[PDB]
Coordinates of C-alpha atoms and ligand atoms in Angstrom, one line a residue:
Chain B
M1 CA 0.0 0.0 0.0
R2 CA 0.9 3.7 -0.2
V3 CA 1.1 6.4 2.4
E4 CA -2.5 7.4 2.1
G5 CA -3.3 3.8 3.1
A6 CA -1.5 4.4 6.4
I7 CA -3.9 7.2 7.4
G8 CA -6.1 6.5 10.4
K9 CA -6.7 3.7 12.9
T10 CA -5.1 5.9 15.6
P11 CA -4.9 4.8 19.2
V12 CA -6.9 6.2 22.2
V13 CA -5.3 6.7 25.6
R14 CA -6.8 7.2 29.0
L15 CA -5.4 10.1 31.1
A16 CA -4.2 9.0 34.6
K17 CA -2.3 11.9 36.2
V18 CA -3.9 15.2 35.1
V19 CA -7.3 13.9 36.0
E20 CA -8.8 13.8 39.5
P21 CA -10.9 11.1 41.3
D22 CA -14.1 13.2 41.0
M23 CA -13.8 13.3 37.2
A24 CA -15.3 11.0 34.6
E25 CA -12.8 9.0 32.6
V26 CA -11.0 11.1 29.9
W27 CA -9.8 9.4 26.7
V28 CA -7.7 11.1 24.1
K29 CA -7.4 9.9 20.4
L30 CA -3.9 10.6 19.1
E31 CA -4.3 11.9 15.6
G32 CA -0.7 13.1 15.5
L33 CA 0.3 9.5 14.8
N34 CA -0.9 9.8 11.2
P35 CA 1.8 9.9 8.4
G36 CA 1.2 13.6 7.8
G37 CA 1.4 14.3 11.5
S38 CA -2.2 15.3 12.1
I39 CA -5.9 14.7 11.9
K40 CA -5.9 16.6 8.7
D41 CA -4.5 13.6 6.8
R42 CA -8.1 12.3 6.9
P43 CA -10.0 15.2 5.2
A44 CA -7.0 15.8 2.9
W45 CA -7.3 12.3 1.6
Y46 CA -11.1 12.3 1.5
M47 CA -11.3 15.6 -0.4
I48 CA -8.9 14.3 -3.0
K49 CA -10.4 10.8 -3.2
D50 CA -13.8 12.3 -3.5
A51 CA -12.6 14.5 -6.4
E52 CA -11.2 11.4 -8.1
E53 CA -14.5 9.6 -7.6
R54 CA -16.5 12.5 -9.1
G55 CA -14.2 12.7 -12.1
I56 CA -12.6 16.0 -11.3
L57 CA -9.3 14.4 -10.8
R58 CA -7.4 11.2 -12.0
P59 CA -4.2 10.2 -10.1
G60 CA -0.8 10.5 -11.8
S61 CA -2.2 13.2 -14.1
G62 CA -0.1 16.1 -12.8
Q63 CA -3.4 18.0 -12.4
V64 CA -3.2 21.1 -10.3
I65 CA -4.7 21.4 -6.8
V66 CA -4.7 24.8 -5.0
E67 CA -5.7 25.7 -1.5
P68 CA -5.1 28.7 0.8
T69 CA -3.5 27.1 3.8
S70 CA -0.1 26.6 5.4
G71 CA -1.3 24.5 8.3
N72 CA -2.0 20.8 8.8
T73 CA -4.4 20.7 5.8
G74 CA -1.5 22.0 3.7
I75 CA 0.8 19.3 5.0
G76 CA -1.8 16.6 4.4
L77 CA -2.6 17.8 0.9
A78 CA 1.1 18.0 0.1
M79 CA 1.6 14.4 1.3
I80 CA -1.3 13.1 -0.8
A81 CA -0.4 15.2 -3.8
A82 CA 3.2 13.8 -3.7
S83 CA 2.0 10.2 -3.4
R84 CA -0.7 10.5 -6.1
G85 CA 1.1 12.7 -8.6
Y86 CA -0.7 16.0 -8.4
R87 CA 0.8 19.5 -8.6
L88 CA -0.1 21.3 -5.4
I89 CA 0.0 25.1 -5.0
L90 CA -0.5 26.5 -1.5
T91 CA -1.1 30.2 -0.9
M92 CA -0.2 31.8 2.4
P93 CA 0.8 35.1 3.9
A94 CA 4.5 36.0 3.4
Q95 CA 5.1 36.2 7.1
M96 CA 5.0 32.4 7.2
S97 CA 7.7 30.7 9.4
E98 CA 10.7 29.1 7.6
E99 CA 10.1 25.9 9.5
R100 CA 6.6 25.4 8.1
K101 CA 7.7 26.4 4.6
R102 CA 10.4 23.7 4.8
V103 CA 7.9 21.0 5.7
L104 CA 5.5 22.0 2.9
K105 CA 8.4 22.2 0.4
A106 CA 9.8 18.9 1.5
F107 CA 6.6 17.3 0.2
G108 CA 7.0 19.2 -3.1
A109 CA 4.2 21.8 -2.6
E110 CA 4.7 25.1 -4.5
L111 CA 4.3 28.0 -2.2
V112 CA 2.8 31.4 -3.2
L113 CA 3.5 34.1 -0.5
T114 CA 0.8 36.7 -0.4
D115 CA 0.5 40.3 1.0
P116 CA 1.4 40.1 4.7
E117 CA -0.9 43.1 5.4
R118 CA -4.0 41.5 3.8
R119 CA -3.4 38.3 5.8
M120 CA -5.7 35.3 5.0
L121 CA -7.8 37.4 2.7
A122 CA -4.9 37.8 0.2
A123 CA -4.2 34.1 0.4
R124 CA -7.8 33.2 -0.4
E125 CA -7.8 35.7 -3.3
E126 CA -4.7 34.2 -4.9
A127 CA -6.0 30.7 -4.5
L128 CA -9.2 31.7 -6.3
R129 CA -7.2 33.5 -9.0
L130 CA -5.1 30.4 -9.6
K131 CA -8.2 28.2 -9.6
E132 CA -9.7 30.4 -12.4
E133 CA -6.5 30.8 -14.4
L134 CA -5.5 27.1 -14.3
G135 CA -8.9 25.5 -14.0
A136 CA -7.4 23.9 -10.9
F137 CA -9.1 21.9 -8.2
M138 CA -9.6 23.7 -4.9
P139 CA -10.4 21.3 -2.0
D140 CA -12.2 24.2 -0.1
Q141 CA -11.7 22.7 3.3
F142 CA -14.2 24.8 5.2
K143 CA -17.1 24.0 2.9
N144 CA -16.3 20.6 1.3
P145 CA -18.7 17.9 2.6
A146 CA -16.0 15.2 2.0
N147 CA -14.1 16.7 4.9
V148 CA -17.1 15.9 7.2
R149 CA -17.5 12.5 5.6
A150 CA -13.9 11.5 6.4
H151 CA -14.8 11.7 10.1
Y152 CA -18.2 10.3 9.8
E153 CA -16.7 7.2 8.0
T154 CA -13.4 6.7 9.8
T155 CA -12.7 8.9 12.9
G156 CA -16.1 8.4 14.4
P157 CA -16.4 4.6 13.9
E158 CA -12.9 4.2 15.3
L159 CA -13.6 6.2 18.4
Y160 CA -16.9 4.5 19.0
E161 CA -15.4 1.0 18.6
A162 CA -12.4 1.7 20.8
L163 CA -14.5 2.9 23.6
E164 CA -17.0 0.1 23.1
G165 CA -19.9 2.5 22.5
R166 CA -19.5 3.9 26.0
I167 CA -19.2 7.7 25.5
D168 CA -21.1 10.3 27.5
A169 CA -19.5 13.4 26.0
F170 CA -17.4 14.2 22.9
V171 CA -15.2 17.3 23.2
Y172 CA -13.3 18.9 20.3
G173 CA -11.7 22.2 19.3
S174 CA -13.2 23.1 16.0
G175 CA -11.3 24.4 13.0
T176 CA -13.1 23.6 9.7
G177 CA -15.9 21.9 11.7
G178 CA -15.4 18.6 9.9
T179 CA -14.3 16.5 12.9
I180 CA -17.0 17.6 15.3
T181 CA -19.7 17.3 12.7
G182 CA -18.6 14.0 11.3
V183 CA -17.8 12.3 14.7
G184 CA -20.7 14.1 16.4
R185 CA -23.3 12.8 14.0
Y186 CA -21.9 9.3 14.1
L187 CA -22.1 9.2 17.9
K188 CA -25.5 10.9 18.2
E189 CA -27.0 8.3 15.8
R190 CA -25.9 5.6 18.2
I191 CA -25.8 7.2 21.7
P192 CA -29.1 8.9 22.5
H193 CA -27.6 10.8 25.5
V194 CA -24.1 11.8 24.2
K195 CA -23.2 15.4 24.5
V196 CA -21.1 17.1 21.8
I197 CA -19.2 20.0 23.1
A198 CA -17.2 22.5 20.9
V199 CA -14.1 24.2 22.1
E200 CA -12.8 27.5 20.9
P201 CA -10.3 30.2 22.0
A202 CA -11.7 32.8 24.4
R203 CA -9.7 35.2 22.3
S204 CA -11.7 34.3 19.2
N205 CA -15.0 33.2 20.7
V206 CA -17.4 33.5 17.7
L207 CA -19.4 30.3 18.5
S208 CA -20.0 31.8 22.0
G209 CA -21.4 35.0 20.5
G210 CA -18.1 36.9 21.0
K211 CA -15.6 38.3 18.5
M212 CA -12.7 37.0 16.4
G213 CA -9.2 37.7 17.5
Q214 CA -5.6 36.6 17.4
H215 CA -4.8 33.5 19.5
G216 CA -2.2 30.8 19.8
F217 CA -4.2 27.6 19.3
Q218 CA -2.8 26.8 15.9
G219 CA -5.2 24.8 13.8
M220 CA -8.5 25.6 15.6
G221 CA -10.6 28.7 16.1
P222 CA -10.8 30.2 12.6
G223 CA -12.6 33.3 13.7
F224 CA -15.7 32.4 11.7
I225 CA -18.4 29.8 11.5
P226 CA -17.5 27.4 8.7
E227 CA -20.1 25.8 6.5
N228 CA -18.8 22.3 7.6
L229 CA -19.8 23.0 11.2
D230 CA -23.3 21.8 12.0
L231 CA -24.4 24.0 14.9
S232 CA -27.5 21.9 15.6
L233 CA -25.3 19.1 16.9
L234 CA -23.7 21.2 19.6
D235 CA -24.8 20.9 23.3
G236 CA -22.4 23.6 24.4
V237 CA -19.3 25.6 23.8
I238 CA -16.3 25.9 26.1
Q239 CA -13.9 28.9 25.8
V240 CA -10.3 28.3 26.6
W241 CA -7.3 30.5 27.4
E242 CA -3.7 29.8 26.4
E243 CA -2.8 30.8 30.0
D244 CA -4.5 27.6 31.1
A245 CA -4.1 25.3 28.1
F246 CA -0.3 25.6 27.7
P247 CA 0.6 24.7 31.2
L248 CA -1.7 21.8 30.9
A249 CA -0.1 20.6 27.7
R250 CA 3.2 20.7 29.5
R251 CA 1.7 18.6 32.3
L252 CA 0.4 16.1 29.7
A253 CA 3.9 15.7 28.3
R254 CA 5.7 15.4 31.7
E255 CA 3.0 13.4 33.5
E256 CA 1.3 11.3 30.8
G257 CA 4.1 11.0 28.3
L258 CA 1.8 12.7 25.8
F259 CA 3.7 15.4 23.8
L260 CA 0.8 17.1 22.1
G261 CA 0.1 20.3 20.0
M262 CA -1.2 23.7 21.1
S263 CA -4.9 22.9 20.2
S264 CA -4.6 19.6 22.2
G265 CA -3.9 21.5 25.4
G266 CA -7.0 23.6 24.9
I267 CA -9.1 20.6 24.0
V268 CA -8.0 18.5 26.9
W269 CA -8.4 21.4 29.3
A270 CA -12.1 21.6 28.2
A271 CA -12.4 17.9 28.4
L272 CA -11.3 18.0 32.0
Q273 CA -13.9 20.6 32.8
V274 CA -16.6 18.4 31.3
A275 CA -15.2 15.4 33.1
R276 CA -15.6 17.1 36.5
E277 CA -19.2 18.0 35.6
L278 CA -20.2 14.5 34.6
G279 CA -18.4 12.8 37.5
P280 CA -17.0 9.2 38.2
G281 CA -18.2 6.4 36.0
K282 CA -18.9 8.6 33.1
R283 CA -16.7 8.7 30.0
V284 CA -15.5 11.8 28.1
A285 CA -13.8 11.4 24.8
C286 CA -11.7 14.0 22.9
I287 CA -9.2 14.1 20.1
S288 CA -5.7 15.4 20.0
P289 CA -5.3 17.0 16.5
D290 CA -1.5 16.7 16.4
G291 CA 1.7 16.2 18.4
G292 CA 4.1 18.7 19.8
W293 CA 6.7 18.1 17.1
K294 CA 5.9 21.2 15.0
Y295 CA 5.8 23.5 18.0
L296 CA 9.2 23.4 19.6
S297 CA 9.8 27.0 18.5
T298 CA 6.6 28.3 20.1
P299 CA 5.7 29.6 23.6
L300 CA 4.3 26.1 24.4
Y301 CA 7.6 24.3 24.5
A302 CA 10.2 27.1 24.0
Chain J
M1 CA -4.5 2.2 27.9
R2 CA -1.5 4.4 28.3
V3 CA 1.0 5.8 25.8
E4 CA 3.3 2.8 26.1
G5 CA 0.4 0.7 24.9
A6 CA 0.3 2.8 21.7
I7 CA 3.8 1.7 20.7
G8 CA 4.2 -0.5 17.6
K9 CA 1.8 -2.0 15.1
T10 CA 3.3 0.4 12.5
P11 CA 2.4 0.3 8.8
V12 CA 4.5 -0.8 5.9
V13 CA 4.4 0.9 2.5
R14 CA 5.6 -0.1 -0.9
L15 CA 7.7 2.3 -2.9
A16 CA 6.3 3.1 -6.3
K17 CA 8.3 6.1 -7.8
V18 CA 11.9 6.0 -6.7
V19 CA 12.1 2.3 -7.7
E20 CA 12.6 1.0 -11.2
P21 CA 11.0 -1.9 -13.1
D22 CA 14.2 -4.0 -12.9
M23 CA 14.1 -3.9 -9.1
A24 CA 12.5 -6.2 -6.6
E25 CA 9.7 -4.7 -4.6
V26 CA 10.8 -2.4 -1.8
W27 CA 8.7 -2.1 1.4
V28 CA 9.4 0.4 4.1
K29 CA 8.1 0.0 7.7
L30 CA 7.3 3.5 9.2
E31 CA 8.6 3.5 12.8
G32 CA 8.2 7.3 12.9
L33 CA 4.5 6.8 13.6
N34 CA 5.2 5.7 17.1
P35 CA 4.1 8.0 20.0
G36 CA 7.7 8.9 20.8
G37 CA 8.4 9.6 17.1
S38 CA 10.8 6.7 16.4
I39 CA 11.6 3.0 16.5
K40 CA 13.4 3.6 19.8
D41 CA 10.0 3.6 21.5
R42 CA 10.2 -0.2 21.4
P43 CA 13.5 -0.8 23.1
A44 CA 12.9 2.1 25.5
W45 CA 9.7 0.4 26.7
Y46 CA 11.2 -3.1 26.6
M47 CA 14.3 -2.1 28.7
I48 CA 12.1 -0.5 31.3
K49 CA 9.4 -3.2 31.3
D50 CA 12.2 -5.8 31.5
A51 CA 13.7 -4.0 34.6
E52 CA 10.2 -4.0 36.2
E53 CA 9.8 -7.7 35.5
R54 CA 13.3 -8.4 37.1
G55 CA 12.4 -6.4 40.2
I56 CA 14.9 -3.6 39.5
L57 CA 12.1 -1.1 39.0
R58 CA 8.5 -0.7 40.1
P59 CA 6.3 1.9 38.3
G60 CA 5.2 5.1 40.1
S61 CA 8.1 4.8 42.5
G62 CA 10.0 7.9 41.4
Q63 CA 13.1 5.7 41.0
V64 CA 15.9 7.1 38.9
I65 CA 16.9 6.0 35.4
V66 CA 20.0 7.4 33.8
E67 CA 21.3 7.0 30.2
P68 CA 24.0 8.8 28.2
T69 CA 21.9 9.7 25.2
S70 CA 20.2 12.8 23.6
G71 CA 18.8 10.9 20.6
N72 CA 15.7 8.9 19.9
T73 CA 16.4 6.5 22.8
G74 CA 16.4 9.5 25.1
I75 CA 13.1 10.6 23.7
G76 CA 11.6 7.2 24.1
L77 CA 12.9 6.8 27.6
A78 CA 11.6 10.2 28.6
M79 CA 8.2 9.4 27.3
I80 CA 8.0 6.1 29.2
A81 CA 9.6 7.6 32.4
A82 CA 6.9 10.4 32.2
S83 CA 4.1 7.9 31.8
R84 CA 5.3 5.4 34.4
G85 CA 6.5 7.8 37.1
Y86 CA 10.3 7.5 36.9
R87 CA 12.9 10.3 37.3
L88 CA 15.0 10.3 34.1
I89 CA 18.4 11.9 33.9
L90 CA 20.0 12.1 30.4
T91 CA 23.7 13.0 30.0
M92 CA 24.9 14.5 26.8
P93 CA 27.6 16.9 25.4
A94 CA 26.9 20.6 26.1
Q95 CA 26.9 21.4 22.4
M96 CA 23.5 19.8 22.1
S97 CA 20.9 21.6 19.9
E98 CA 18.3 23.7 21.7
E99 CA 15.6 22.0 19.7
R100 CA 16.5 18.5 21.0
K101 CA 16.9 19.7 24.5
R102 CA 13.4 21.2 24.3
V103 CA 11.9 17.9 23.3
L104 CA 13.6 16.0 26.1
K105 CA 12.7 18.6 28.7
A106 CA 9.1 18.6 27.4
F107 CA 8.9 15.0 28.6
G108 CA 10.4 16.0 32.0
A109 CA 13.8 14.5 31.5
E110 CA 16.6 16.2 33.5
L111 CA 19.6 17.0 31.3
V112 CA 23.2 17.0 32.4
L113 CA 25.4 18.7 29.9
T114 CA 29.0 17.3 29.8
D115 CA 32.4 18.5 28.5
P116 CA 32.0 19.4 24.8
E117 CA 35.6 18.5 24.2
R118 CA 35.3 14.9 25.6
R119 CA 32.2 14.3 23.6
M120 CA 30.3 11.0 24.2
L121 CA 33.1 9.8 26.5
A122 CA 32.2 12.5 29.1
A123 CA 28.5 11.7 28.7
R124 CA 29.1 8.0 29.4
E125 CA 31.3 8.9 32.4
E126 CA 28.7 11.1 34.0
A127 CA 26.0 8.5 33.5
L128 CA 28.2 5.9 35.2
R129 CA 28.9 8.4 38.0
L130 CA 25.2 9.0 38.6
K131 CA 24.4 5.3 38.4
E132 CA 26.9 4.7 41.2
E133 CA 26.0 7.7 43.3
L134 CA 22.3 7.3 43.1
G135 CA 22.1 3.5 42.7
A136 CA 20.1 4.4 39.5
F137 CA 19.0 2.1 36.7
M138 CA 21.0 2.5 33.5
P139 CA 19.2 0.9 30.5
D140 CA 22.5 0.5 28.7
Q141 CA 21.0 0.5 25.2
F142 CA 24.1 -0.9 23.4
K143 CA 24.3 -4.0 25.6
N144 CA 20.9 -4.7 27.1
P145 CA 19.4 -7.9 25.5
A146 CA 15.9 -6.5 26.2
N147 CA 16.6 -4.1 23.3
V148 CA 17.0 -7.0 20.9
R149 CA 14.0 -8.8 22.4
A150 CA 11.8 -5.8 21.7
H151 CA 12.4 -6.4 18.0
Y152 CA 12.4 -10.2 18.1
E153 CA 8.9 -10.1 19.8
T154 CA 7.2 -7.1 18.0
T155 CA 9.0 -5.5 15.1
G156 CA 10.0 -8.8 13.5
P157 CA 6.6 -10.5 13.8
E158 CA 4.8 -7.4 12.5
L159 CA 7.1 -7.2 9.4
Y160 CA 6.8 -10.9 8.7
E161 CA 3.0 -10.9 9.0
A162 CA 2.4 -7.7 7.0
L163 CA 4.5 -9.1 4.1
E164 CA 2.9 -12.5 4.4
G165 CA 6.2 -14.2 5.1
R166 CA 7.5 -13.2 1.6
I167 CA 10.8 -11.5 2.2
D168 CA 14.0 -12.1 0.3
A169 CA 16.2 -9.5 2.0
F170 CA 15.9 -7.3 5.1
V171 CA 18.0 -4.1 5.1
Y172 CA 18.6 -1.9 8.1
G173 CA 21.0 0.9 9.2
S174 CA 22.4 -0.3 12.5
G175 CA 22.8 1.9 15.6
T176 CA 22.6 -0.2 18.8
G177 CA 22.2 -3.4 16.8
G178 CA 18.9 -4.3 18.4
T179 CA 16.7 -4.0 15.4
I180 CA 18.8 -5.9 12.9
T181 CA 19.5 -8.6 15.4
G182 CA 16.0 -9.0 16.7
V183 CA 14.2 -8.8 13.3
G184 CA 17.1 -10.7 11.6
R185 CA 16.8 -13.6 13.9
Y186 CA 13.0 -13.7 13.7
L187 CA 13.1 -13.8 9.9
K188 CA 16.0 -16.3 9.5
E189 CA 14.2 -18.8 11.8
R190 CA 11.3 -18.7 9.3
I191 CA 12.8 -17.8 5.9
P192 CA 15.7 -20.2 5.1
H193 CA 16.9 -18.0 2.2
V194 CA 16.4 -14.5 3.6
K195 CA 19.5 -12.2 3.5
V196 CA 20.1 -9.7 6.3
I197 CA 22.1 -6.7 5.1
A198 CA 23.5 -4.0 7.5
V199 CA 23.8 -0.4 6.4
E200 CA 26.4 2.0 7.8
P201 CA 27.9 5.4 6.9
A202 CA 30.8 5.2 4.5
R203 CA 32.3 8.0 6.8
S204 CA 32.1 5.7 9.8
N205 CA 32.4 2.2 8.2
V206 CA 33.6 0.0 11.1
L207 CA 31.5 -3.0 10.1
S208 CA 33.2 -2.9 6.7
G209 CA 36.7 -2.9 8.3
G210 CA 37.1 0.8 8.0
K211 CA 37.3 3.6 10.6
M212 CA 34.9 5.6 12.7
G213 CA 34.2 9.2 11.7
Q214 CA 31.8 12.0 11.9
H215 CA 28.7 11.7 9.7
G216 CA 25.2 13.0 9.3
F217 CA 23.0 9.9 9.6
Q218 CA 21.6 10.7 13.1
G219 CA 20.7 7.6 15.0
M220 CA 22.8 5.1 13.1
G221 CA 26.5 4.3 12.7
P222 CA 27.9 4.6 16.3
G223 CA 31.5 4.2 15.2
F224 CA 31.8 0.9 17.1
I225 CA 30.5 -2.6 17.1
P226 CA 27.8 -2.9 19.9
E227 CA 27.3 -6.0 22.0
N228 CA 23.6 -6.1 20.8
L229 CA 24.7 -6.6 17.1
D230 CA 25.0 -10.3 16.2
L231 CA 27.5 -10.2 13.3
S232 CA 26.9 -13.9 12.5
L233 CA 23.5 -12.9 11.2
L234 CA 24.8 -10.5 8.5
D235 CA 25.1 -11.5 4.9
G236 CA 26.6 -8.2 3.9
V237 CA 27.2 -4.6 4.7
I238 CA 26.4 -1.6 2.5
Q239 CA 28.2 1.7 3.0
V240 CA 26.2 4.8 2.2
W241 CA 27.1 8.5 1.6
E242 CA 25.0 11.5 2.6
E243 CA 25.7 12.9 -0.9
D244 CA 23.5 10.0 -2.2
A245 CA 21.1 9.5 0.7
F246 CA 19.9 13.0 1.3
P247 CA 18.8 13.7 -2.3
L248 CA 17.0 10.3 -2.2
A249 CA 15.2 11.2 1.1
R250 CA 14.0 14.4 -0.6
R251 CA 12.7 12.3 -3.5
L252 CA 10.9 10.0 -1.1
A253 CA 9.1 13.0 0.4
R254 CA 8.2 14.6 -2.9
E255 CA 7.5 11.5 -5.0
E256 CA 6.2 9.0 -2.4
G257 CA 4.8 11.4 0.2
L258 CA 7.2 9.8 2.7
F259 CA 8.8 12.5 4.9
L260 CA 11.5 10.5 6.6
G261 CA 14.6 11.0 8.7
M262 CA 18.3 11.1 7.8
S263 CA 18.9 7.5 8.5
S264 CA 15.9 6.5 6.4
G265 CA 17.5 8.1 3.3
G266 CA 20.6 5.9 3.8
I267 CA 18.6 2.8 4.6
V268 CA 16.3 3.1 1.6
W269 CA 19.2 4.0 -0.7
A270 CA 20.9 0.7 0.3
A271 CA 17.6 -1.2 -0.1
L272 CA 17.3 0.0 -3.7
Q273 CA 20.8 -1.3 -4.4
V274 CA 19.8 -4.7 -3.0
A275 CA 16.5 -4.5 -4.9
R276 CA 18.3 -4.0 -8.2
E277 CA 20.5 -7.0 -7.4
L278 CA 17.6 -9.4 -6.6
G279 CA 15.4 -8.2 -9.5
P280 CA 11.7 -8.3 -10.3
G281 CA 9.4 -10.6 -8.3
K282 CA 11.7 -10.6 -5.2
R283 CA 10.9 -8.6 -2.1
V284 CA 13.2 -6.3 -0.1
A285 CA 12.0 -5.1 3.3
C286 CA 13.6 -2.2 5.3
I287 CA 12.6 0.0 8.2
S288 CA 12.4 3.8 8.5
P289 CA 13.6 4.6 12.0
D290 CA 11.9 8.0 12.2
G291 CA 10.2 10.7 10.2
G292 CA 11.6 14.0 9.0
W293 CA 10.0 16.1 11.8
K294 CA 13.0 16.5 14.0
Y295 CA 15.3 17.4 11.0
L296 CA 13.9 20.6 9.5
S297 CA 17.0 22.5 10.7
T298 CA 19.5 20.1 9.1
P299 CA 21.1 19.9 5.6
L300 CA 18.5 17.3 4.7
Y301 CA 15.5 19.7 4.6
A302 CA 17.1 23.1 5.2
Ligands
PLP401 C1 -7.6 21.0 11.7 C2 -7.1 21.2 13.1 C3 -8.1 21.3 14.1 C4 -9.6 21.3 13.9 O1 -10.2 20.1 13.2 P1 -11.4 20.3 12.2 O2 -11.9 19.0 11.7 O3 -10.8 21.1 11.0 O4 -12.4 21.1 12.9 C5 -7.6 21.5 15.4 N1 -6.3 21.5 15.7 C6 -5.4 21.4 14.7 C7 -3.9 21.4 15.1 C8 -5.8 21.2 13.4 O5 -4.9 21.1 12.4
PLP402 C1 18.1 3.9 16.9 C2 18.1 4.5 15.5 C3 18.6 3.7 14.4 C4 19.2 2.2 14.6 O1 18.3 1.2 15.3 P1 19.0 0.2 16.3 O2 18.0 -0.9 16.7 O3 19.4 0.9 17.5 O4 20.1 -0.4 15.5 C5 18.6 4.2 13.2 N1 18.1 5.5 12.9 C6 17.7 6.2 14.0 C7 17.1 7.6 13.6 C8 17.6 5.7 15.3 O5 17.2 6.5 16.3

């Protein structure tokens, strides 16, 4: 098989030190163990495979794929494009870190650096311009239903099976909305009482009725409500602060041997809050989007 | 389960672009998908578990473990020590990169920086001094048979099973010798004709009768013959140059979607040479010790 075949089937671990006796069990699915280093491997593969199934793409064609991202989705798309023979162009603000650019270029992605002042807007604009000029395929991660489908068909079933259908609450820090929608729907169809709780940065708390803002939870909290997020599934929203999440992420690494990413610290912090509310005997499940490997040069581990 | 339970059961992928039609199949087992980021998770866990079984250690005791390493074994040991409640002290030359120190400290390992001029010798000396002063447990990765056992009991069986017992040659870049000895023995006991080929840096070619020297294949080629390496198992030794291995590693990332480490480039390069020799129909298996994540600030991906 090829690298795309190695995506998924990730393990789930039960926290034992950062939890307290009055809390429900807390289980964390480790998506950083994917070949691309994050949970985004799943929607990256699904969006490309879906495009192949629909006839938009054919592998080994050299066809162009373009997406305005420099994050985990960019890494996942680059990995798949490399394996299946597609030309990938990623647009992103020019103030992008050298480290991240090196990872993307390692996979052969072409990078187009856009106006640092216009931020994400300029990146989106260039991706649209390229899509039109080249007749390229744009995954469109925030609106593509195949993103949600990836989680409804793989992540959800895996989580449900591993925890033997015993889940009282599912907690996740939403980015594109694909994971919480896909997993959330899968669980709610089988567990009548399960609660689906979204997590977002207090500094960019739009789901809570607040306002967008800069924050340090890379990968989550886009500052807007994506089309792939089904709000009707949510039973609540927990706002998290880096001041609380980062120290917790460090505890996870030193006390549980779980070296996770920035968003994982926020997600697990929220999961613990839910665990205290539900109490002993109950089970809270959450997902770690990625490991700490890409963040050694950030406040989390610096 | 805990993080140590998530070690192993790694996938194997078949190369499709860097290979040529006149070559045997080339399969690569991805050990970078382990929770600690490398194949060393296996011997790290086995050496600690073996010590617990023998009564040297008891988990959650706070007992001290000391080892002269700053590499993947250090990361693996730190992860396990964090999860099972041991105090880990790692000794290493003071010229250690900040990046690596950050990973080790993230897991809670205590670092003792030794004389930069005495290199590894000073690190070994301090570990021995601490072992004596504190009555600590020193895994002793180059001589501990539990290292070999990890691969004889897990890595080998996994590789054999995944390739349905059809393996004509096993190729690996030796460090402590545990992997090639453990996997090699497992395969030779079942495949009468299988060849076990060791790989080492041409710049530190001691297995080839040459001399030790500085090289860039982090994790392999220790410059000496470790006690854990069973020379009687070897059917040959291939010397590799960074000049050849690094460009190949970049091709693997851009053409196969396999973002691997420095030693993987050397190991796969050698595997391709063996594949050309065996020809079509045959099957060559090798292992990628780790991914490219820890090497973005090295000549390989810089
Ligand atoms: C993508 C991502 C998320 C959010 O997952 P979605 O399915 O997009 O909601 C969270 N953290 C990180 C690090 C991510 O890359
Ligand atoms: C440990 C290691 C090796 C060698 O494996 P051994 O079982 O110790 O021979 C090769 N490459 C890397 C990156 C390693 O960490």
